[PDB]
Amino acid sequence: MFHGKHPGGLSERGRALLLEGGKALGLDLKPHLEAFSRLYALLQEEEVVVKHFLDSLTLLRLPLWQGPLRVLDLGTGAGFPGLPLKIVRPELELVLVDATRKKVAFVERAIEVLGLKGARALWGRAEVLAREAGHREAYARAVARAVAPLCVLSELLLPFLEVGGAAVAMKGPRVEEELAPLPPALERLGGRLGEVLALQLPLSGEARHLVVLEKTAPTPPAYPRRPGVPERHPLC
Numbered sequence: 001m002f003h004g005k006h007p008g009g010l011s012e013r014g015r016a017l018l019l020e021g022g023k024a025l026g027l028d029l030k031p032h033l034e035a036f037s038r039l040y041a042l043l044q045e046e047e048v049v050v051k052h053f054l055d056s057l058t059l060l061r062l063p064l065w066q067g068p069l070r071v072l073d074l075g076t077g078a079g080f081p082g083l084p085l086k087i088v089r090p091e092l093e094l095v096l097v098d099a100t101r102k103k104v105a106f107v108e109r110a111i112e113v114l115g116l117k118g119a120r121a122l123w124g125r126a127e128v129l130a131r132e133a134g135h136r137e138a139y140a141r142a143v144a145r146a147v148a149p150l151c152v153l154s155e156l157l158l159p160f161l162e163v164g165g166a167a168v169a170m171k172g173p174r175v176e177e178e179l180a181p182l183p184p185a186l187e188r189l190g191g192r193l194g195e196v197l198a199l200q201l202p203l204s205g206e207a208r209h210l211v212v213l214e215k216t217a218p219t220p221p222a223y224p225r226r227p228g229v230p231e232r233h234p235l236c
C-alpha cells in the first residue's frame, strides 16, 4: 500500500498520513488535500512537513475560530500555524506577520497560489506594529509558534488583542518554567492566563501545549517596549 508518487505535491503516502493525522484531531481534511499538497510542493522530508501541518491544526482543539474573526499570526515564518488554520477555517480574516522579508514573500506567494481570500502577509516588527492604530487592539485572536519564551511572547501578542480577545502560544513538551512567573507579567499587560491545554501530536505522539492568553483590559501605553527590548529585558 501507499506506493503512488507525486512529482509536484504530497505523495500517496503523505496524503494518507495527513488524512489520518487529521482524523485523529477530529478533522476531515479530504476537501483540503489539494491545498495542503500545493503548500507542500511550495515548501519544497514529506513526513516532517505533514507533521507541521498537523501541529498547526492542533489549534482547532480549542473552539476559538468561529466566524469572520480578525486573526494575527505573529512570526509566521513560512506561514505556520496561520496558513493551515486559514485553509480549514476560511472565514477567518488573517494577517500573517514576519520580521524577515523572504518569509513574508513566501507567504504572499502561498496565498496567491492557494487562492486564499481574506489573508495577507505583512513585513514588520511586532513592537512597531502594536503601536499603530491599525493593529493595536484590532484583533480578536493572535497566535504564535516560537522559541521566544511566554513572558516575551505575552508582551508581543497581548497588545494586538481587543478586550475579550484571546491569543494562543503554541508550545512544546515543557512549559512549567515559562509559565511559573507569567501571571504577574500578564496583569501588567491587560491579560489573564486562560487555559493551558496539554495534548499529543497525531502520528508521533509528541507532547504539546496550547497556552491561551485572555485579553482582560486595555494594554497600558508603555507596552510593547521598543524593538528587541522585550527579548533582551523580559517582563518576567
Ligand SMILES: Nc1ncnc2c1ncn2[C@@H]1O[C@H](CSCC[C@H](N)C(=O)O)[C@@H](O)[C@H]1O
Residues within 6 Å of the ligand: 074, 075, 076, 077, 078, 079, 080, 081, 097, 098, 099, 100, 103, 124, 125, 126, 127, 144, 145, 146, 147, 156
Ligand atoms: N518581534 C518580531 N516581529 C515579527 N516577527 C518576529 C519577531 N520575532 C521573531 N519573529 C519571526 O518569527 C519566526 C520564528 S521561526 C518560526 C516560524 C513559524 N512560526 C513556525 O513555527 O513554523 C521567525 O521567522 C522570525 O522572523
